[PDB]
Amino acid sequence: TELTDARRYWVDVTLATNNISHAVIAEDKRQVSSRAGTGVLGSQSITSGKHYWEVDVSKKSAWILGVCAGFQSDAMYNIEQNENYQPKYGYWVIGLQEGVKYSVFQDGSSHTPFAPFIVPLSVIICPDRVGVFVDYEACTVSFFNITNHGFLIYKFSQCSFSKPVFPYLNPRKCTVPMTLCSP
Known part of the structure; x- marks a missing residue:
């Protein structure tokens, strides 16, 4: 009733792009969302066969790389925001931090579902x-x-x-680029 009355004045709102927000506005100006993290995917899905690629991480002090089934479950477990990468959420990744600390990201306890189980890797030759x-x-x-x-x-x-899964790269706050090598 109050709502029914209000709806008589329904107007067609579209959003203005501004240059003060980190917000992302859709092309049609009718949808807006936030950015999370710095993870990117390869452009072509993998759904069969064998696939090899190489990533140059020279001089980088931090990164995440591997394979990802996409960002579909990123919101529910705040994945990119809190680096909550787990196989159960479609991430098979290893990472580097602080120049010399390498880890693999594994499934964590469902009793603490917003944090992964991070296992140190023994890396001798960086x-x-x-x-x-x-x-x-x-x-x-x-x-x-x-x-x-x-x-x-x-x-x-x-x-x-x-x-479907995809190559996954994340430069992880380190400003040095990471690069896909050829072939």
Whole structure:
């Protein structure tokens, strides 16, 4: 009734782009959202077969890289915002922080679902370049230390590949670029 009366004055609101906000306004100016983190995906989904690529992380003091099933579940567990990367949320990633601290991101307790279980990696020869290998049929994601004779850094097995997955890169507040090498 009060609402019904109010609706008589329904107007067509569109948003103004401004240059004071970090807000992201859709092309049609009828939708707005926030940005979270600095994670980016490859442009082509992987839903079959074997895929290899290499990421140059020379001189970077921090990063996250691996494979991601997308940002669909980012909001519910505040993933990018709190670096809550877990296989159960569609992330198979390793990371570096503070120049020398390498870790793998694993599933954490559901009793504390907003924080992952971070496991230190033993890295002796710091990688300038990391190879990432997805075998979608086998459900594995492998990380190779190109700088260290290509020795395996870590391998995720029995991955829950029920959805398309993508290369995942995150420069993680470190201003040094990370680069996809060719081929």
